[PDB]
Ligand binder design. Structure first.
Ligand SMILES: [Zn+2]
Ligand SMILES: [Zn+2]
Ligand SMILES: [Zn+2]
Ligand SMILES: [Zn+2]
Ligand SMILES: [Zn+2]
Ligand SMILES: [Zn+2]
Lengths: 72, 72
């Protein structure tokens, strides 16, 4: 559609790591952002976050081709 | 052929609005997707996007009959 997520996790909340899309190993995206992007052949995993915030839409934390349809 | 576009616009990049195909007035498709679909008697216009991403292939933003040959 015509035009950062920043959703927040608590201690035991799950999220996705995607090693193909991350800027570095501390980056992560929320489950909705993961589900609305394309990671089909990517090396992704469900993680327990220990808290933090979603990197989707932030080119300094996540590769743009890994953004979801709502944060491009 | 056998089986979302998500191409991204910058601020001053053009795209197409199709009022016949859009799910709402904030939806748009890129020029290649417009040219590879059928909008013959549709109420379409070239627009300056102000940024965003192409909705072609996403049934939640665009009517499937409006998808191009590459996103069906
Ligand atoms: Zn998110
Ligand atoms: Zn997102
Ligand atoms: Zn990925
Ligand atoms: Zn497109
Ligand atoms: Zn298309
Ligand atoms: Zn149309």
């Amino acid at each position: 559609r015509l035009g950062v997520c920043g959703s927040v996790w608590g201690q035991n909340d799950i999220a996705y790591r995607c090693r193909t899309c991350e800027n570095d190993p501390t980056c992560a995206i929320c489950v909705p952002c993961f589900q609305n992007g394309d990671h089909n052949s990517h090396d992704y995993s469900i993680i327990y976050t220990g808290g933090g915030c979603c990197d989707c839409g932030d080119e300094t934390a996540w590769k743009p081709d890994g953004f979801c349809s709502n944060h491009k």
